[PDB]
From Swiss-Prot, chain A:
Family under the similarity heading: Belongs to the TAF4 family.
Protein name (Swiss-Prot/TrEMBL): Transcription initiation factor TFIID subunit 4
Compartments reported by the entry: Nucleus
Disease cited in the entry: Intellectual developmental disorder, autosomal dominant 73: An autosomal dominant disorder characterized by intellectual disability ranging from mild to severe, developmental delay, speech delay, behavioral abnormalities, and non-specific dysmorphic facial features.
Subunit organization: Component of the TFIID basal transcription factor complex, composed of TATA-box-binding protein TBP, and a number of TBP-associated factors (TAFs), including TAF1, TAF2, TAF3, TAF4, TAF5, TAF6, TAF7, TAF8, TAF9, TAF10, TAF11, TAF12 and TAF13. Component of the TFTC-HAT complex, at least composed of TAF5L, TAF6L, TADA3L, SUPT3H, TAF2, TAF4, TAF5, GCN5L2/GCN5, TAF10, TAF12 and TRRAP. (Microbial infection) Interacts with SV40 Large T antigen.
Domain of life: Eukaryota
Region (Minimal region required to interact with TAF12) residue spans: 2-43
Functional summary from the UniProt entry: The TFIID basal transcription factor complex plays a major role in the initiation of RNA polymerase II (Pol II)-dependent transcription. TFIID recognizes and binds promoters with or without a TATA box via its subunit TBP, a TATA-box-binding protein, and promotes assembly of the pre-initiation complex (PIC). The TFIID complex consists of TBP and TBP-associated factors (TAFs), including TAF1, TAF2, TAF3, TAF4, TAF5, TAF6, TAF7, TAF8, TAF9, TAF10, TAF11, TAF12 and TAF13.
Swiss-Prot record, chain B:
Similarity comment: Belongs to the TAF12 family.
This protein's name: Transcription initiation factor TFIID subunit 12
Role played: The TFIID basal transcription factor complex plays a major role in the initiation of RNA polymerase II (Pol II)-dependent transcription. TFIID recognizes and binds promoters with or without a TATA box via its subunit TBP, a TATA-box-binding protein, and promotes assembly of the pre-initiation complex (PIC). The TFIID complex consists of TBP and TBP-associated factors (TAFs), including TAF1, TAF2, TAF3, TAF4, TAF5, TAF6, TAF7, TAF8, TAF9, TAF10, TAF11, TAF12 and TAF13.
Subunit structure of this chain's protein: Component of the TFIID basal transcription factor complex, composed of TATA-box-binding protein TBP, and a number of TBP-associated factors (TAFs), including TAF1, TAF2, TAF3, TAF4, TAF5, TAF6, TAF7, TAF8, TAF9, TAF10, TAF11, TAF12 and TAF13. Component of the TATA-binding protein-free TAF complex (TFTC), the PCAF histone acetylase complex and the STAGA transcription coactivator-HAT complex. Component of the PCAF complex, at least composed of TADA2L/ADA2, TADA3L/ADA3, TAF5L/PAF65-beta, SUPT3H, TAF6L, TAF9, TAF10, TAF12 and TRRAP.
Protein location: Nucleus
UniProt note on tissues of expression: Ubiquitous.
The organism of origin for this protein: Homo sapiens
């Protein structure tokens, strides 16, 4: 996984508590990791351009 | 706690341009951006979920926000 699975999991779970969320589907972690990799991938590509 | 490593970041950078070591400050900035991204996205998603009258965070929620506020299609 691009991002660190354990702390990511914990941090997502953590942000949810503050926002009416009690649980989170499993692969949501991976999905967020993928999205974050895209966010950063585009910026880097742009920066190198 | 750290969710992304300097190593993994650098692999990403390398993937875009194999010969290009990024300045540490830029590395930190990007690590900071990933943090804001996770924060805002997950936060906005939880809202969508809560709206579904739900309490379990699901891809559906994150995807909906990404597509709408980031025009990211994954």
């Amino acid at each position: 996984m691009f991002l660190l699975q354990a702390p990511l999991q914990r941090r997502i779970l953590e942000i949810g508590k503050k926002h009416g969320i009690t649980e989170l589907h499993p692969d949501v972690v991976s999905y967020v990791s993928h999205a974050t990799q895209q966010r950063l991938q585009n910026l880097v590509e742009k920066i190198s351009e | 706690h750290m969710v992304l490593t300097k190593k993994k970041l650098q692999d990403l950078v390398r993937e875009v341009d194999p010969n290009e070591q990024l300045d540490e400050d830029v590395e930190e900035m990007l690590l900071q951006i990933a943090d804001d991204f996770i924060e805002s996205v997950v936060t906005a998603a939880c809202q969508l979920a809560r709206h579904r009258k739900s309490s379990t965070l699901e891809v559906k929620d994150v995807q909906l926000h990404l597509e709408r506020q980031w025009n990211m299609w994954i």
